[PDB]
Each structure stands twice: as structure tokens, then as C-alpha cells.
Design a protein around this ligand. Structure first.
Ligand SMILES: O=C(O)c1cccc([C@H]2CCC[C@@H]2c2nc3cccc(O)c3[nH]2)c1
Ligand SMILES: O=C(O)c1cccc([C@H]2CCC[C@@H]2c2nc3cccc(O)c3[nH]2)c1
Ligand SMILES: O=C(O)c1cccc([C@H]2CCC[C@@H]2c2nc3cccc(O)c3[nH]2)c1
Lengths: 157, 160, 160, 157, 160, 157
């Protein structure tokens, strides 16, 4: 059973590590898929985001980190994935997630969207909030893997 | 991995929305237990025996579904059934706040049990057993939302 | 087009929020039926006869409003009254999820009936008959939220 | 009775056609009003959006398609409209719609805002989602009128 | 300014979430009254006398908290206690719509009373007394969510 | 007892005046703190926003208007504030407010976030909506202090 966990991961946070770890306890192979997302004008290049996520997930044996610029559904078909994982923090996320999931089902009906809920510890964070705090020199060590925190410090230095 | 999943609910009665969710669950997990709550928080329209037989007939075509009644917490039932996945259906009209309370409480009770939210077809995204029962009790047409056996049992129940 | 609209509810009692909605509806549709549900999902404070008389007196100044009791589904009542519009009030504190369930169910029952959501004045956007009754039952001042006839009937009801 | 159905319609989708069709079954004359919306940096010019909507609604006798850069409320007064139609898909839309409707009521109290709910078929789509999928060469034929789908393909070609 | 604040609720039973909120309130206001509602909208598990004693023992370490029972509207109680601040806890799973209704109604009843929303620790953001009671009634472990005295009283209540 | 009411205030509205007035009835000293917020590309400079808010709050004796580009939590520590005030209009605001409040608690646990609800009169307005209406020459006199309305007219003239 192959699952894809797609996202912008700009950068990957402890909330993302929490979701992917839960995914590996459920499915045999997990593809952590980083979308290029140019419309979002990401802080880190796709190459950087892939490198950060690879290092941050090295301890999880059945995680493969890959980048993509393709349509989500086509990339999942090309990875032979039948499960699409997304983390759900609150009601605000739930509405937008439904649109993407119904569109993905329209484009690939055999690809099942599944939602997981992060730990209470990471239920109020996002890449956007972590970047906002770090842009103002606020301490975000608690929310990011060690290698990611270093890269975010270095990127803003 | 040989995953066992539970799909708990009152299923009073089981609807096409519940059939859609359990079918999706059988496509991703090796064994699915459709778990029917014995207890009435509010007194159910169908008895536990009626709810189980209706669900069995309606899922008989799905080879890896087992219909089982339970009277304990859904976390305690998952533990006793050696299930590590708890299926929750997430309709467009779900109480997302309650789902968050339930998932965090289930994780506290059984940390190794993972709550998995599945999405029904758009067709069943705006219905509930509660709404179906209200409509049927007030002489409205609900045939479209139910398996045929459930439609027949519901008409018989409302006739008497 | 000579449109007939229904505005259903329990109106237990009718409030200034309901008056605001029905007034807005009379400004856009030729005939508005303020439709009062006979049934108690939960037992109502005022009887159906009391709810109808209060609503009639409170809307007497609106020439194209008819107050009518009904005991069937709001879709079945709309069909029998040859109404093609169903008015729903949408306060800031409405259960939008339930409104979606209700609208899709009404469309399933009567496809030609269109659910129309109207917005009350900001003044009445945070009240409900339920909240008004709780406040009044616990000796709080609710005069501001009610038509004068309703205020008089509510004080008489709570006195005994 | 004259109703206005205003929006950016960048581009008009089957969800918009669903709403305007419902509006024509209720009101004698419906003005489908396309806002220029430069702040939103639209994909299609106002002239293109008007042309697409005109062709997409040609089968509906009592629909008039017009463009505007004016304040919403002033344009409705100038069209002699007393009804303002807006489609409501979910809770996320409902909150922003309330602000606009109360502002419109402040600017023109006789202009009644009315909300309609689209078919379940179009309850999870938006112009933004359709454009995102099409930018990644995903099939959106199901969600758009034929002429709109052609124009979106041609615009992205 | 010598501010007096009330923190009303049914506290049936008082949980670690309520302790967190009242502790935060004592850090910003000079005197906090933890106000326990006497009335059963729904019949409470613990009697008013039980709810008051449990809350007193659980807040005994906070010098500026007074635990008091009341049977009137929370606005009327705030007025009689000369309180100008009404504390509301805002968990991640709160009914924000109801909180808005309540705040606007309290402002109508007592304009000088300001509703203040406090946020609990993430640890208690997904629990409620209602959920705690359901879990405990169905033999689940709730020790983590309660003060020790409450855990002991709840086990005794469920044993009989 | 010292409270900070931070925000972009681009420009300050009657809804903001309502919140700060409520704050002064509760706390001895209130700091109305205007964040520079360059990421939001504000209409008014920080200097203009500070001047507008100073004039708009001159009648309130225990309000001090200050600008800042610092991390929120650091600025509150530096003002010796133990209370952080934020206005709550609806559910949509409530979710984002929770993230900021939990982040602020992580950065300064003694800084208590408190939420106040504005009057029904200002429950459906925002700086963004007022600017949108004014950009289209719509009347916004009802929603802004006199000096702010003049400045918004002059800025758009
Ligand atoms: O709400 C449903 O969808 C539901 C479905 C089936 C069963 C039940 C109830 C029935 C009695 C105990 C059951 C129960 N409540 C719980 C609360 C928290 C954690 C649990 O593990 C719970 N398990 C509820
Ligand atoms: O919930 C209200 O605002 C409401 C108002 C008036 C009446 C009613 C109930 C009263 C009994 C049957 C009525 C009824 N429920 C329905 C459910 C789905 C579709 C319908 O057509 C329904 N019509 C409810
Ligand atoms: O819902 C709570 O969290 C709650 C807590 C304590 C008490 C109460 C109820 C108990 C009886 C009257 C009380 C009451 N309802 C009111 C409605 C509007 C305005 C008020 O001032 C109210 N005060 C409710």
C-alpha cells in the first residue's frame, strides 16, 4: 500500500513530521511529495525544500522525499499511490481541503484522500506562522527539525 | 502491513453515505469492522438487532467487512479487536469541532489507534441518519438515501 | 412573475428578527406565507393557536403576509401552497451546516422550490427565540427583541 | 423585478451558470454583472470575461451580461435593481458575504442581498481551483461551459 | 483599578481546563468569583453542593478566588457582585456562534459588564466536562483531565 | 496593569476605537501598538497610521499610541505589558487569532491574550473592506473617525 503526503513544505515543520510519522505507521510506503508551488512565491527553492525534508525524515525507513511541479493527481498516479494524506488542524483548513479532495477524486477516483489530525503540540502552527516569527528574529527552535531551523536562520541571516 | 480498521457509529439506520464510507475503507485496509453502538444517548429508531441485520445485508457484497455490535467506548472496542485504525466519515455538514474532541480523546485513551477521516461522495455529503429519519417520520421521500433493505425496514417501522 | 414564498419556522415566539426577515421578503415577493410549524421537536412555550395569533397581530401592518399553521414537511406545505420560494433567515449566529442540509433536502423533495437566504438587520443578528426564552425565563429584560403584543403575552405566560 | 448577480467571474464556471439559472426562475430580469476587479489581478480581461459570460448564458432569455468598475451598490442603483444575488457554497464564504451584504445595505438599504445555494455538483469548485488545475494541464471540461473551457485552454496554450 | 471578575459555568465537574482559565483570570484581575450555576438545563451529574465543594478544594491554592453558587442570569449575578468583567473560556472546540449570542445578550442586559475571552493551554483545548463525563460513564480513563479531588469524587459517583 | 492592543491599523476604524475604549475601562494603561507590517503592503506609512491613531484616540486619557517593527512578544515585554488585547468579530478571525495567541504564549507565557467583542455596529467591518469601498468612491464616513476619513479621502484623491 503506497501513500503520498503532498504539500508546499516551505519549510517542513514538526507538524509535518508528526503527520508523515503517523502515515508510516499505517502504510507500507510513504512518498513525502513537495510541490514547487511558484504561485505561493516560496522562501526556499524546491531543491532546498527536498534536501531539508530528506534530512528531517532520514530516521523513518519507509519515507521517500520527492519534488514535483506536475498536477497532484497525475503525480500520485505516476507514483502508483492509492492514498493521499493531508493533515487537518482546524475548521478553516477543512473547507479548502474538501475542494482539493473532490477535485483530486474527479481527476483520479481510485486515489483516496485521507485526513489525519496532528498532535495538540502542533495544532496551532503553520510554515507561514513560523516564517513570520523568524523574520522578526523570534525563537522557532521548538517547531522545526534541527536542520530546518539552521537553514531558516541561515536563509534570514 | 495487515491493518484492521473499525468504523463505529449508531447506524440508525445505515444510509448510502455510510455504505460509501465503509466501501472506501475496504479499498485501503485489509479488514474493516463496521461497529454498531448498542447504547442510546437518545433512544434509537431501530433496535441494535435490527441495526446489525440491516448493516449486514447492506454490506454483504463487501468481502472484508464484518458487522459487530459493541457497548463500550469505541477506543476500548478498537483495542479488543486489535484495530489500529478508527474510520470517521467527514461529510461537508460534519461537526468538525466535535471530531477534533473525539480524535484527541481517542488518542489519549489508545495512543496507537489512529483516527482516519474519509470523505463521502458529494451525493451523500449533506445527509445524516438524523435528517433522513426526520424527513421519513414527516412523510417525505428518502428512498434515494438508503439501501433497498433499509428503505423496506424503515417503511415497515413507520407504518406501525 | 407572480411569486409565492413561504417563510417557515416554529416562531416560539415570533421576534423582531423574524419581523425584519418577513418584511424584507414582502419587499421582493408578491405573496408571503409566514408558516408556523404545529409540531414540537421539543415542546414549544406557546401553543400553535397562541403562536399564530401573535404572528398575525405582529404582521397585520404588512398587506401581503398570510399567517398559516402547518403540520407537514415545509417542502410538502410549499407544494400545496403553490409556493416556489422558501425563505430562510440567516443571522450571524446561524448553523450554516444545518441550513445546507435543509436546502439540499428541500431541493431533493421539491426540485422547483428555491431556498432563498435573507439577512436580518445587525440589530437582530445575534438573537434567537431560544435565547430570548432562556433570558425571559431567568428574569432578564427581553422587551427590545419582541413586538409589543409578544412582550405582553410572554410576561403573562411567565407569570403563571 | 430586477436582480443583479455580481462577481469577478474569472472565468465563469458551471457553478455560476447554476446560480444565474436559479435567479432567472425567480426574477423577471437578471443582470450578470462582471466586476473589473484589478486588485485580484484577473487572468482574463473584463472584455474577455463579458464575452465568455455572454456566450455561456445565450440560452437564457432574461439574462443581460454587463461589465463594471464602479462601486457595487452604485451599479445596482444604476441598473434599477432591488435584489443582489450571491451564491453560497460553504461556511468560509458565508462570513465574507455577510460583510459585503451589510456594507451594500449601508450604501443602498433598498437593495436586498439574497443568497442561493448551488447544486451539490458545483459545491466544491471555484474559478481559482479550476485555474489552478488548468495551469497544471489537468482536465476541467466538466466544470466549465464549452466556450469558457476553449478560452481557458487557448489562454494557457 | 480594583477589578472584580466573574467566571460562570455549570462546572459539572470542574476540569483542569477550568482550573487553567480561572488561574489565568487571577493573574489579571484583583478578585475572581468562580460562579457555579444552580440550575439544570439538563440534570447535572453532581449536585450544586458537590460542585461547589469540589471547585473550592481545587482552587484553595489561589488566594483571590471565591467559589459561589447562583441561580439567576450570569449578568444579574455579575451586577449583584459588583463585577465588571465576565470571563469566558475559549477552547479550540468552543461554539463561537453561541459565545457571540451570549456576549451580545450580556451587553444588552448589563452594558457596563465586559465579556473577556481567555484561551486555555493547548493541553486542555479539546476537552469539555460533557466529553469527560461520557468517557468516564463508559469506563474510560479521565484522570489526566481532572484535579485529584474531582477524580476521587467522580469514581465514587460512578461506583454507585 | 498594562495592556497592549497590537495591529496593522491600516487605517484605524470605529471598530478599533470601540475595542481600545473597552480596553481602557478594564486596564489602567493601554498601549495601542501599530505594527509596520510591510508584508501586507499597507496603504498608509507607519508614521501616518501612528498620527491618525493618536488624533483618533486623543479623548482617551490612558491610551498611548506607539509604532513597532519588532516581534509582537518582544515589544509587549519591552512595554512591561502582561495583557494582549485582540478584537474578535467572527469564527474566521477566531482560528487565526488562536495561532498567534499560542505563539505569543510560547514566546512570553506571562503575556495573557484576551479577546473582546466589538459592538454589533462594527461587527461586519474591517480596514480592508473600508479601503475597498473608498477606492470605489463609496461613502465610509460612518465607519471611521473624522481625521481618518479625511486622510483616506486625501490619500485616494
Ligand atoms: O460519536 C460517535 O460517532 C459514536 C460512535 C459510536 C459509539 C459512540 C459512543 C456510544 C457509547 C460510548 C461510545 C463512545 N463515546 C466516546 C467518546 C470519546 C471517546 C470514545 O472512544 C468514545 N466511544 C459514539
Ligand atoms: O428547521 C426548521 O427551521 C423548521 C421549520 C419549520 C418546520 C420544521 C419541521 C417541523 C416538522 C417537519 C418540518 C420539516 N423538517 C424538515 C426537514 C427537511 C426538509 C423539510 O422540508 C422539513 N420540514 C422545521
Ligand atoms: O451558558 C453558560 O455558559 C452558562 C453559565 C452559567 C449559567 C448559565 C445559565 C443558567 C441559568 C441562567 C444562566 C444564564 N443564561 C444566560 C443567557 C444569556 C445571558 C445570561 O446572562 C445568562 N445567564 C449559562
Amino acid at each position: 500500500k503506497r501513500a503520498i503526503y503532498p504539500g508546499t513544505f516551505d519549510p517542513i515543520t514538526n507538524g509535518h513530521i508528526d503527520i508523515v510519522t503517523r502515515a508510516t505507521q499505517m502504510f507500507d510506503h510513504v512518498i513525502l511529495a513537495i510541490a514547487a508551488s511558484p504561485s505561493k512565491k516560496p522562501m526556499f527553492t524546491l531543491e532546498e525544500r527536498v534536501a531539508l525534508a530528506q534530512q528531517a525524515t532520514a530516521h523513518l525507513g519507509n519515507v521517500e522525499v520527492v519534488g514535483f511541479s506536475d498536477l497532484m493527481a497525475n503525480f500520485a498516479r505516476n507514483q502508483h499511490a492509492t492514498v493521499l494524506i493531508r493533515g487537518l488542524r482546524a475548521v478553516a483548513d477543512f473547507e479548502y481541503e474538501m475542494q482539493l479532495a473532490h477535485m483530486n477524486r474527479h481527476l483520479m477516483p481510485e486515489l483516496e484522500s485521507v485526513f489525519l489530525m496532528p498532535s495538540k503540540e502542533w495544532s496551532f502552527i503553520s510554515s507561514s506562522l513560523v516564517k513570520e516569527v523568524a523574520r522578526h528574529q523570534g525563537d522557532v527552535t521548538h517547531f522545526l527539525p534541527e536542520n530546518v531551523h539552521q537553514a531558516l536562520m541561515a536563509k534570514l541571516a
